[PDB]
Design a protein around this ligand. Structure first.
Ligand SMILES: *[C@@H]1O[C@H](CO)[C@@H](O[C@@H]2O[C@H](CO)[C@@H](O[C@@H]3O[C@H](CO)[C@@H](O)[C@H](O)[C@@H]3O)[C@H](O)[C@H]2NC(C)=O)[C@H](O)[C@H]1NC(C)=O
Ligand SMILES: *[C@@H]1O[C@H](CO)[C@@H](O[C@@H]2O[C@H](CO)[C@@H](O)[C@H](O)[C@H]2NC(C)=O)[C@H](O)[C@H]1NC(C)=O
Ligand SMILES: *[C@@H]1O[C@H](CO)[C@@H](O)[C@H](O)[C@H]1NC(C)=O
Ligand SMILES: *[C@@H]1O[C@H](CO)[C@@H](O)[C@H](O)[C@H]1NC(C)=O
Ligand SMILES: *[C@@H]1O[C@H](CO)[C@@H](O)[C@H](O)[C@H]1NC(C)=O
Ligand SMILES: *[C@@H]1O[C@H](CO)[C@@H](O)[C@H](O)[C@H]1NC(C)=O
Ligand SMILES: *[C@@H]1O[C@H](CO)[C@@H](O)[C@H](O)[C@H]1NC(C)=O
Ligand SMILES: *[C@@H]1O[C@H](CO)[C@@H](O)[C@H](O)[C@H]1NC(C)=O
Lengths: 53, 108, 173, 173, 173
C-alpha cells in the first residue's frame, strides 16, 4: 500500500528507517539507505556479561 | 570486621550475541546494529511524493493511455512506483525497443 | 576474565548496583553497600561512544537506486549484475559480521583490562597495610570509615594512617 | 610472551609432554614428571573450534560459474570484467591475508593470556607459603606429595596445611 | 595504560631522552640521567618494520587504466560502472580506515605491553631488596653505582650483593 508518511529510504517490502547502517531485509532500495546482507542479526555489545548466583 | 571489595554491574537481562569464542553470549546491555524491519508501507521521500502508475505499464503511462491518468501536474517526484505485472501494456500491440535504456533514462 | 578476573578469579556479576558498570562494594561497621566508579566507567563509555560513531560514520550512503532489469537477450549483463551485486553483498556481509564478532571480543577485553587495572590501583595503596582475601576483595588489618572509602576511591590513602595498626594486627597472624 | 612469559620470563618449550598444550611439571621425592592441564587446555581448544567454524562458515559458496568470453567488439566489457574480477580477487586476497596474520597474532596472545592467568592461579594459593624461583616455577618451603600436586592442579590447597612449615623454613632465610 | 601504565600508574612523557623510545632514568650519588633501552626498543621497532612492510606489500598495483566513457544510449553501463567503482572505493576506503584505527590501537597496546613487561623485569630482580615507590620507580634500601645500573639494565643483579643491606635498612621501616 501507499501512504502519506515520509521517509529517507524505501524498498518494496516497506519504507525504511535510514538511521542504522544495515539491513538483511531486501536488496532493492532507493534513497539514503542502509546496506543489505545475507544475515540473521547483527548486535554489538554495549554492556557485558550477566551472571547472578 | 571491615572489608573493601570490587564491584560491577549485572541485571535481569538475557540479551545475547554470538562471538568468536562463545555463542548466545548473554550480556546486560546490547545494541542491535541492524534494521531488520520494514514498516510495510510506501511512504515518500523528504516530503517529495513518488510517482504512481497503479496498474499501468510505462507504455500506458508515457504514451497517453486514457485509462492511465496522464497527470501532467506530476512534474518531478521522489521515485517511481509500479507493480511487477502491470496490466496495461499497449492496447494496439507493437514492439517497443530499448525499454531498459528508456527506463534508465527515466530513473530520475 | 581473559586477563584473569571475570569468570577468572571473579565468578559472577552483581545486580545490586545499576548506576554504573563498575564500582566497589564497601563493608564496614556503619554497614554494607555498593558504589559505582563513574570515573573509569564514564571514560570507558566515552570510548564506546567514539567507537560506535567511528563504526557507523565509516559508511557513506549515497542517494542510491539499487535495481535494474533486462530482457533475455541481455543474459550476460543479467547474470553478471547478479554476480556483481551478490559479490558485494557477500563481501559487506562477511566483513561486517567479522567486525561484530571481533569488536565485541575486544569490547570484553577492554572491560577486562579496565577492571584488572582498577584492581591493581586498589592494590597499589594497600600492599602491606591490608591483605588479599578470597577473590575480588581485600580485608583490612585496620578499620575504615566512609571517608576512608571515598578517599580510597579517588586514589588517596595516606599510607602511614593505619600503617602501624596493620603492623600489629598482622603480627598475630 | 606479549604479556611476559613465552620468550618472556619463560625462554623455551618442552617436548616431554604431548597430551595437551598446557600443564605443570611436578618435582618431588617420588620423582619428576609432566602432567597436562586438560581443563584450560580443552577450554582454549574449544575456543579454537568455535573460531575456525566462525571463519569457514562466514563464506557462502554459491553454485557458481566463473567465466565469460567476448569478441573484440566488446573490449569495454572485457577489460571491465577483468577489472571487476581482479578487483574482487585482490580484495578477498587482501582481507583474508590480513585476517590470517591478525588471527594468528591474537591466537598467540590468547595462549599468552591463558598461561599467564594460570600462573597467577598457581601463585594465588601459595603466596607466602612458597616462593617464586628463577622463572616459571615455585619452590616450596614444605614438602608436597602427588595428592598435594593434584589438589593444587584443580584449585585446592588448604592454606593452613603447610603454613607453619613455611613459617619456619622461611625464617632461616 | 590499557594494561595500567601510560596515563595509568604513569602520568606523562619525558622529553629529556631522544635516543630511543624506552629506557630508564638512573638516580645515584654520581648524579641523574636518562638512558635508552635499545634492546626491547629495537626489537619493537623491527616489529613495526615487519608490520608496515606487511601492510604496504599486501596491495598489488597493476599497470592500470582507470577510466571509461559512454554515450547516453549506454546509461546502464554508465550508472553501473559508477555503482561498481564507487562500490569498490567505498569498500577499500572502509576497510583501510578501520585498519588504520585498529592497527594504531594495537600499536599503543603493543607499546603498553612492552613497557609493562619491562617493569616486571625490573621488578623481578629487586623484589625484597628494594621497594616500589610512587609510580614508575623503585627506591633502593642500598646504594647503586653505574656498574649496578648497567648490570640491572641487561638482566643481571647478583641478588645476594645488597641483600643484607636491604635486610637492615628495611628494618627501621
Ligand atoms: C487495461 O487493463 C485492463 C485489465 O487487464 C484491460 O481490461 C481487460 O482486457 C481484456 C483483454 O483481453 C478483456 O478480456 C477480453 O474481453 C473481451 C470482452 O470485453 C473479449 O472479447 C476477449 O475475448 C477477452 O475476454 C477483459 O475483459 C478486460 N477486463 C476489464 C476489467 O476491463 C483493459 O482493456 C486495458 N485497457 C487499455 C486501454 O490498455
Ligand atoms: C487494477 O486492476 C484491477 C483488476 O483486479 C481493477 O479491479 C476492478 O475494479 C472494478 C471497480 O473499479 C471492479 O468492478 C472490477 O470487478 C475489478 N476487477 C477485478 C479483476 O478485481 C482495478 O480497478 C484496476 N485499477 C486501476 C487504477 O486500473
Ligand atoms: C528510526 O530509528 C531510530 C533509531 O533506531 C529511532 O530513534 C526512531 O524512533 C525510528 N523512527 C521510526 C519512524 O521508526
Ligand atoms: C528486566 O528489567 C527491565 C527493567 O526493569 C524490564 O524492562 C524488563 O521487563 C525485565 N524483564 C524481566 C524478564 O523481568
Ligand atoms: C547456548 O548454547 C549452548 C550450546 O550448548 C546451550 O547449552 C545453551 O542452552 C544455549 N542457550 C540458549 C539461550 O540458546
Ligand atoms: C578524595 O576523597 C576525599 C575524601 O574521601 C576528599 O577529601 C578529596 O577531596 C577527594 N579528592 C578528589 C580529587 O576528588
Ligand atoms: C581436587 O583434587 C583432590 C586431590 O588432589 C581431590 O580430592 C578433589 O576431589 C579434587 N576436586 C575436584 C573438584 O576435582
Ligand atoms: C651486563 O652488564 C654488566 C655490567 O653492568 C657487564 O659486566 C656484563 O657483561 C653485561 N652482560 C651482557 C650480557 O651484556
Amino acid at each position: 500500500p501507499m501512504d502519506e508518511c515520509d521517509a529517507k529510504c524505501q524498498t518494496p517490502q516497506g519504507a525504511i528507517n535510514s538511521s542504522l547502517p544495515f539491513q538483511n531485509v531486501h536488496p532493492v532500495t532507493i534513497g539514503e539507505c542502509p546496506k543489505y546482507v545475507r544475515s540473521a542479526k547483527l548486535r554489538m555489545v554495549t554492556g557485558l556479561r550477566n551472571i547472578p548466583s | 570486621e571491615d572489608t573493601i571489595c570490587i564491584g560491577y554491574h549485572a541485571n535481569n537481562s538475557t540479551d545475547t550475541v554470538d562471538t568468536v569464542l562463545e555463542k548466545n553470549v548473554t550480556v546486560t546491555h546490547s545494541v542491535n546494529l541492524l534494521e531488520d524491519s520494514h514498516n510495510g508501507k510506501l511512504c515518500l521521500l523528504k516530503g517529495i511524493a513518488p510517482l504512481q502508475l497503479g496498474n499501468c505499464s510505462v507504455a500506458g503511462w508515457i504514451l497517453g493511455n486514457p485509462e492511465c491518468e496522464l497527470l501532467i501536474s506530476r512534474e518531478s517526484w521522489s521515485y517511481i512506483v509500479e507493480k511487477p505485472n502491470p496490466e496495461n501494456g499497449t492496447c494496439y500491440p507493437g514492439h517497443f525497443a530499448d525499454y531498459e535504456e528508456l527506463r534508465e533514462q527515466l530513473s530520475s | 576474565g581473559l586477563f584473569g578476573a571475570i569468570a577468572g578469579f571473579i565468578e559472577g556479576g552483581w545486580t545490586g548496583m545499576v548506576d554504573g558498570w563498575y564500582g566497589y562494594h564497601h563493608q564496614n561497621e556503619q554497614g554494607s553497600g555498593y558504589a559505582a566508579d563513574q570515573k573509569s566507567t564514564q571514560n570507558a563509555i566515552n570510548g564506546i561512544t567514539n567507537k560506535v560513531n567511528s563504526v557507523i560514520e565509516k559508511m557513506n550512503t549515497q542517494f542510491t537506486a539499487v535495481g535494474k532489469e533486462f530482457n533475455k537477450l541481455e543474459r550476460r549483463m543479467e547474470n553478471l549484475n547478479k554476480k556483481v551485486d551478490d559479490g558485494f553483498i557477500d563481501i559487506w556481509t562477511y566483513n561486517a559480521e567479522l567486525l561484530v564478532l571481533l569488536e565485541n571480543e575486544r569490547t570484553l577485553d577492554f572491560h577486562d583490562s579496565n577492571v584488572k587495572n582498577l584492581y591493581e590501583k586498589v592494590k597499589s595503596q594497600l600492599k602491606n597495610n591490608a591483605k588479599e582475601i578470597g577473590n575480588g576483595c581485600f580485608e583490612f588489618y585496620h578499620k575504615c570509615n566512609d571517608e576512608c572509602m571515598e578517599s580510597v576511591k579517588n586514589g588517596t590513602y595516606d599510607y602511614p594512617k593505619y600503617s602501624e595498626e596493620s603492623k600489629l594486627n598482622r603480627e598475630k597472624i
